[PDB]
């Protein structure tokens, strides 16, 4: 069984590296799709629900204005994100189906995840019970086992980036901060509530920041609010580095013990960063009832299934004013995006 995990990850790395070295490009075009509705705001343009004309399949299409990407100095991040998305393959990662570009825009067409993001569900429901939180947490644990085995650090875990699919399972989205990192890296990035102390303290850091963020996520899912919050980020940062955390009285002893070991300011003590790696987390008492293989196969009954009345249902997304998508008659920023 342990040998089965090693074999799986070795094959996953072989597959990843092939696609990483020889990325796909230009695998569809804009007039293969009908635009249906704006699903959300993307970093550089709309995220659209679209319908593939030949198949009738629905997808989420991210539209990125090339001139805006260049203006905000995000060329490398944008190229890197697409390069990652086209190379990875794991059940709890969003799936890039097509990508292409035209005179004005870059396009990433993903599998449409109709439940929207976890954040809204969590704020509506208030908090998740520990079984419910554990179901989601187990998926993140496996996803980080996968990503870290590829030397990818994720760096933006938060409920805002966890989409819920029709079966109630997670698909992680937004790889804008993800980086291939075998050793240390130094960029200040992430979301204040989820930053590990060593990021705040301007140290070189490693994949252990993702395991800290898992602790924050588990805490927020189970409490309904994050462990460190304040009016302004600077006050949040003061709490994060302080070494102090308080738990709701309804947290189980097992939950508190796991969280003390993930929200560990001392890197030499933090679960996920020790000699036994991810297995310190997977073997912890809080996860004793978790069937890791059944989770990976999506065989566990989900605690929550989002409303979804057939393909094209957008009831889990906000409404946005619809504007025409204008493509210039002249190419913009061609050289910068040759690799896309």
């Amino acid at each position: 069984e342990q040998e089965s995990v090693k074999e799986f990850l070795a094959k996953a790395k072989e597959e990843f590296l092939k696609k990483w070295e020889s990325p796909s490009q230009n695998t569809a075009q804009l007039d293969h799709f009908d635009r249906i509705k704006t699903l959300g705001t993307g970093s550089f343009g709309r995220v659209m629900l679209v319908k593939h004309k030949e198949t009738g399949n629905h997808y989420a299409m991210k539209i990125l204005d090339k001139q805006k990407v260049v203006k905000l100095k995000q060329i490398e991040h944008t190229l890197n994100e697409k390069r990652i998305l086209q190379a990875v393959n794991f059940p709890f990662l969003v799936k890039l189906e097509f990508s292409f570009k035209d005179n004005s825009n870059l396009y990433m067409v993903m599998e449409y995840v109709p439940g929207g993001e976890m954040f809204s569900h969590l704020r509506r429901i208030g908090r998740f019970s520990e079984p419910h939180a554990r179901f989601y947490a187990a998926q993140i644990v496996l996803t980080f086992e996968y990503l870290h085995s590829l030397d990818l650090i994720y760096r933006d875990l938060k409920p805002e980036n966890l989409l819920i699919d029709q079966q109630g399972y997670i698909q992680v989205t937004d790889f804008g901060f993800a980086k291939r990192v075998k050793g240390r890296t130094w960029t200040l990035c992430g979301t204040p509530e989820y930053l590990a102390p060593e990021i705040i303290l301007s140290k070189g850091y490693n994949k252990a920041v993702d395991w800290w963020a898992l602790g924050v996520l588990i805490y927020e899912m189970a409490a309904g609010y994050p462990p460190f919050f304040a009016d302004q980020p600077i006050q949040i940062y003061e709490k994060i580095v302080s070494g102090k955390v308080r738990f709701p009285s309804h947290f189980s002893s097992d939950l508190k013990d796991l969280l003390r070991n993930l929200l560990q300011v001392d890197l030499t003590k933090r679960f996920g960063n020790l000699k036994n790696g991810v297995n310190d987390i997977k073997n912890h008492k809080w996860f004793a009832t978790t069937d890791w293989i059944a989770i990976y196969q999506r065989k566990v009954e989900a605690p929550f299934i989002p409303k979804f009345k057939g393909p094209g249902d957008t009831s889990n997304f906000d409404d946005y004013e619809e504007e025409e998508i204008r493509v210039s008659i002249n190419e913009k920023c061609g050289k910068e995006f040759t690799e896309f």
């Binding site: 704020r123 509530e193 994050p226 304040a230 009016d231 709701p248």
Partner: peptide, 18 residues
Amino acid sequence: TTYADFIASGRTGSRNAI
């Protein structure tokens, strides 16, 4: 309560990076 303090923080909505 801690929950009331969270509401008072003004950071109950979706959170941007950086």
